[PDB]
Design a protein around this ligand. Structure first.
Ligand SMILES: O=c1cc(CO)c2ccc(O)cc2o1
Lengths: 128, 83, 97
């Protein structure tokens, strides 16, 4: 999973249709994730990218996964609109998100202990 | 077609059959009433709200609200029901 | 537009949707199919206010933007003389750990 060094400019608008602070992540030519400045909720940003480049987006504070144009965003030939939205989380994952935000890293089963500690992470999703 | 989901404290929630089939655990318990000995009403009502929320949004999608007081119990129920 | 409701009486709660243009009587028909009671033996309430069979749900304050799927509006139900409106509250959550 890497960006194609096409050198063909592609105009892109990062549109945050989510209540989260979106963190854009660019996968460089070696697959390494590169973070870009964050987007407050409901805000947009015109950015300069290239054709064949790879972008994914997360919650800047918790790294929860987000959808762009309903996982990976690849700028194509022209600007292209990147609609970042909340996915329909599972009720379990949604509960884990809320509990994670109220407790620092409980009368719960040992299996759910590891679920709370298995934070969302870009490197883990990249292997997936 | 509707099914009945009974909480631990006796509350009887009547939701659409296809809504309840979202949880694989509930489909096994139906194959039409289900009694939940471990899930109180203030948790099971949120689960049913999630069924409608999931079927409707699966337009911009709003956040599913979870009050902090019910987060831990809803987590255990969601883990058991695998939804 | 769809409105999302909890029709509640005693320890019963029905999760269903309806059109904002549908009438109170048509909602009683939905209840009839589920609880096997005719509309003439049903009273519907918004909080404490009795709803008239001819008025649409939108007229009664059940709008698509307030009766949301993740937070549905509550319609009180009362069966038949007519019993008083009784809605058993949900259990109380424990103290915050
Ligand atoms: O809502 C609940 C609350 C608990 C415990 O408080 C609970 C425990 C086990 C289970 O399988 C489901 C549960 O659901």
């Amino acid at each position: 999973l890497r960006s194609v060094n096409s050198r063909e400019p592609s105009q892109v608008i990062f549109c945050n249709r989510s209540p989260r602070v979106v963190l854009p992540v660019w996968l460089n030519f070696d697959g390494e994730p590169q973070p870009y400045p964050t987007l407050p909720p409901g805000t947009g940003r015109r950015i300069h990218s290239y054709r064949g480049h790879l972008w994914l987006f997360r919650d800047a504070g918790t790294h929860d996964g987000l959808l762009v144009n309903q996982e990976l965003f690849v700028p194509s030939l022209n600007p292209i609109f990147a609609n970042i939205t909340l996915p329909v989380y599972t009720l379990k994952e949604r509960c884990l998100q809320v509990v994670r935000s109220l407790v620092k890293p409980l009368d719960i089963v040992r299996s759910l202990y590891e679920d709370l500690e298995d934070h969302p992470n870009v490197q883990k999703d990249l292997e997936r | 077609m509707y099914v009945k989901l009974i909480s631990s404290d006796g509350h009887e929630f009547i939701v659409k059959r296809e809504h309840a089939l979202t949880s694989g655990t509930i489909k096994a318990m139906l194959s039409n009433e289900v009694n939940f000995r471990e899930i109180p009403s203030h948790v099971l009502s949120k689960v049913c709200m999630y069924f409608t929320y999931k079927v409707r949004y699966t337009t911009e999608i709003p956040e599913f609200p979870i009050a902090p007081e019910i987060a831990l119990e809803l987590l255990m129920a969601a883990n058991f029901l695998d939804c | 537009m769809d409105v999302f409701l909890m029709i509640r009486r005693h320890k019963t709660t029905i999760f269903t949707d309806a059109k904002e243009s549908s009438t109170v009587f048509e909602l009683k028909r939905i209840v009839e199919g589920i609880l096997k009671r005719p509309p003439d033996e049903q009273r519907l309430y918004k909080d404490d206010q009795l709803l008239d069979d001819g008025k649409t749900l939108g007229e009664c304050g059940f709008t698509s933007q307030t009766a949301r799927p993740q937070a549905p509006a509550t319609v009180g139900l009362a069966f038949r003389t007519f019993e008083a409106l009784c809605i058993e509250p949900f259990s109380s959550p424990p103290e915050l750990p």
